[PDB]
């Protein structure tokens, strides 16, 4: 369970940076979309997989840009970042059901 605790700590360490920097990512630009993939979506996938593995939870988080209907690419990034945090909440709820 120590490995799972370390995963939570890594996730929260990553989250603190991602939550502030995501608001500056223009998702409609070439560099911004790429940076969102490289530095937000990819690490999130890895953390979520590491969280789910000790508990048999096999889910694949996918971004849903259709739920972010904004012309402003900064608002898209913030909205997609919120989907990341929401997925965390969903996995935590699944883990708590397994534990209880």
């Amino acid at each position: 369970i120590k490995a799972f605790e370390e995963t939570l700590k890594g996730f929260e360490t990553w989250l603190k940076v991602a939550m502030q920097k995501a608001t500056l990512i223009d998702y409609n630009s070439l560099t911004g979309q790429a940076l969102f993939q490289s530095a937000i979506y990819a690490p999130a996938l890895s953390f979520f997989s590491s969280m789910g593995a000790p508990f048999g939870i096999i889910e694949t988080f996918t971004l849903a840009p259709t739920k972010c209907p904004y012309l402003d690419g900064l608002k898209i990034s913030a909205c997609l970042m919120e989907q990341v945090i929401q997925n965390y909440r969903m996995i935590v709820a699944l883990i708590q059901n397994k534990l209880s």
């Binding site: 630009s29 070439l30 790429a34 990819a42 690490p43």
Partner: protein, 124 residues
């Protein structure tokens, strides 16, 4: 599957596990599905000792991921000054560009990491 384990430990920040994996033959060049090496992930996360371990065991300081970012790009975006300094000391390329011409200085400037931007400007 030592490469995947190393990528995972380097992102999470499991220093002991990274050291164990390198001693047991893990590939320092292991690549995730986004083109990241472990050094990419540790530098982005600010894991200083893991960055040091990976560089000591042969990591390419200037590796590009599939989106055209180097470890220096990611540390300059994320705001980890000490990582940036260590990468520069190990020959990180300040003029590395992503697919739309963005340098590490550009990311540091756009994301408000002023100390890093100043270090990168002086290094250039």
């Amino acid at each position: 599957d030592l490469g995947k384990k190393l990528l995972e430990a380097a992102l999470i920040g499991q220093d002991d596990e990274v050291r164990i994996l390198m001693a047991n033959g893990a590939d320092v060049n292991a690549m995730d599905n986004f083109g990241h090496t472990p050094l990419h992930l540790a530098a982005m996360m600010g894991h200083l000792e893991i960055v040091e371990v990976l560089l000591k065991t042969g990591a390419d300081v200037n590796a590009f991921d599939l989106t055209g970012f180097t470890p220096l790009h990611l540390a300059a975006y994320a705001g980890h000054l000490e990582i940036v300094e260590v990468l520069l000391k190990h020959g990180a390329d300040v003029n590395a560009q992503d697919q739309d011409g963005a340098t590490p200085f550009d990311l540091a400037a756009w994301f408000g990491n002023e100390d890093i931007a100043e270090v990168l400007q002086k290094a250039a």
